[PDB]
Paper text:
In about 60-70% of newly synthesized proteins, the initiator methionine is removed by a metalloenzyme called [name] (MetAPs). Type Ia MetAP is the isoform with minimum sequence and structure required for the catalysis and is present in all prokaryotes. MetAPs have strict substrate specificity towards peptides with methionine on the amino-terminus. Here, we report the discovery of a novel MetAP1a found predominantly in the streptococci bacteria with two new structural motifs one of which may undergo posttranslational modification of glycosylation and phosphorylation.
To further understand the relationship of the two inserts with respect to catalytic domain, crystal structure of the SpMetAP1a is determined at 3.2 Å in the P65 space group with two molecules in the asymmetric unit. The overall structure is similar to that of the E. coli MetAP1a (EcMetAP1a) adopting the pita-bread fold. Since the crystals were grown in the absence of metal salts, the active site is devoid of any metal ions. The metal binding residues are well ordered and interact with each other as was noticed in the human MetAP1b apo structure. Although the overall structure of SpMetAP1a is similar to other MetAP structures in the catalytic domain, there is important difference near the active site. Not withstanding the confirmation of the extra loops (discussed below), a β-hairpin198-211 (equivalent region in EcMetAP1a is 170-183) undergoes a conformational change and occupies the active site where the substrate methionine usually binds. In the new conformation, the metal binding H199 moves away from the active site when compared to analogous residue (H171) in EcMetAP1a. Due to this flip of the β-hairpin, residues in the loop region are forced to occupy the substrate-binding region. Hence, substrate cannot bind to the enzyme in this conformation. The insert region (103Gly–Gly132) forms the extension of the loop within a beta-hairpin. The tyrosine kinase phosphorylation motif (124KKYT) is also well ordered and structurally placed closed to the glycosylation motif.
Numbering used by the authors:
A (entry chain B): 1 to 198, 208 to 286
B (entry chain A): 1 to 286
Amino acid sequence: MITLKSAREIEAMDKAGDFLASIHIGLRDLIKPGVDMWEVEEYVRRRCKEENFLPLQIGVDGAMMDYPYATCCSLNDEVAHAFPRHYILKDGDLLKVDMVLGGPIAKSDLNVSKLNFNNVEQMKKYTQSYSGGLADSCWAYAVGTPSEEVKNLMDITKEAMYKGIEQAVVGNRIGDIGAAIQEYAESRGYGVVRDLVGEPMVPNYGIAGRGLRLREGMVLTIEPMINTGDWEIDTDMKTGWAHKTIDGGLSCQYEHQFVITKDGPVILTSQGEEGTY
Amino acid sequence: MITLKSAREIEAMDKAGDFLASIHIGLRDLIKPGVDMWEVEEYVRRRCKEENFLPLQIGVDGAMMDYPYATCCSLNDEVAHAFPRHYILKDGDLLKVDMVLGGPIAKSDLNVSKLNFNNVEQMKKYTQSYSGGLADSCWAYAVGTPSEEVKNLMDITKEAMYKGIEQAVVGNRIGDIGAAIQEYAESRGYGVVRDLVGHGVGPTMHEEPMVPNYGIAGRGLRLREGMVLTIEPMINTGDWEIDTDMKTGWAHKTIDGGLSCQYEHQFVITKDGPVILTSQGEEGTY
């Protein structure tokens, strides 16, 4: 939804962005060679129960089925929306952890959840009835030590993302972002995903000076999906969720949420110093 | 903005779409071989004056320059946002006419405006101010008798769009629409454009939502009753890649020199299904 947010709904979000940010920070100490990808789900699982946040990915619809996990764990050639699973990570692996968390909410009647060991394992929609403030935010991680293949892939996806941001300046068109993102990644061989066309969201591609003019108070998210070479994407036939690349290439993806603001864009989902993680 | 609406707010658009449709029908007679394309503008200009309807595309902001015309007269291998101009229409040319018009609007000083002469050649930005309700809708035209290559191009886009509409039923997602649009055209090795959704087409516009003509059958807003959306497939023979004019910064053109075509409607998400707000007949027939 495009219509602007009042400063409290903004504040709301930075605090969920605070939280989100911290899971990502806990994750560094955990995404390593030999560990069961599944520890990722459990960590967010665990940390949601401790500080009373909702994993709002649990219960969302699908042609096939609703989304079972709190987390999406897209590994390597998996682009996005893959599941977390029993899998021992490897040195060299590239792993992406998207999630959307809502809170922090207190506790009370059949309205305000205590939210502990209700069965995160099962198909309850307190979730689709929204938890006030939230944040999607995917962040990528090289498990162990990465090929140059990877290191490079990741840097571009990253700077690409932050270059989009750079253009998120008041009095300017969304066109000017996707444009920017497009150019950067695309001017190095890397192909950008289009088939997912990314609460509102900006696409990673477009003709510059050719979109919605940006206002103060809009909160947007930038979610670059870049591939080695080629950009076409599958949709898991069996679950209608996971997306792998088509040419076998790798895909990376970084993602924040910001506010348009005289003085320029301001990030809510920041894990500290930008470009240093 | 991608929210819901009012009930009379819906109304305004149908009434504002009643008018744009009428133009489009008017044009059927107009668009013959031997006719100067510029007529399409002057005509539209003309009818915009006779009822108070502002042509909102004039003054919409842009880089190299603001859009200066009531219409876009895209032509053959031009896919979108090309100017009307003096071109004398060869038999077999494929011409796509896009417009945005707001109103109708009553008259006078500080209570609703008069519109005979603003000089429609000026820096006339009343246009950039919610000018009541309105309607965007491109439509495609064959000048004279159209090749087989063209006949199909026009027919496949026309249908693909209506196939999109079919999906716009309360409780589907936007994905479902764009997917099925994508599929239909792509199944005859037609190309579908992606490089521009102006995501929300605030280009040649102000604010209104835009479903994209490609996607996955999940990845978008589940669509509730009361949403009003436009839909507009640019299709190409062959390549979906697109120019953008360097001199003026508007006109988009197929990369390989193929032909492109575009149709467009808007509609409300009612609970009978979707009710098309910009109709100029019974559907499939025009």
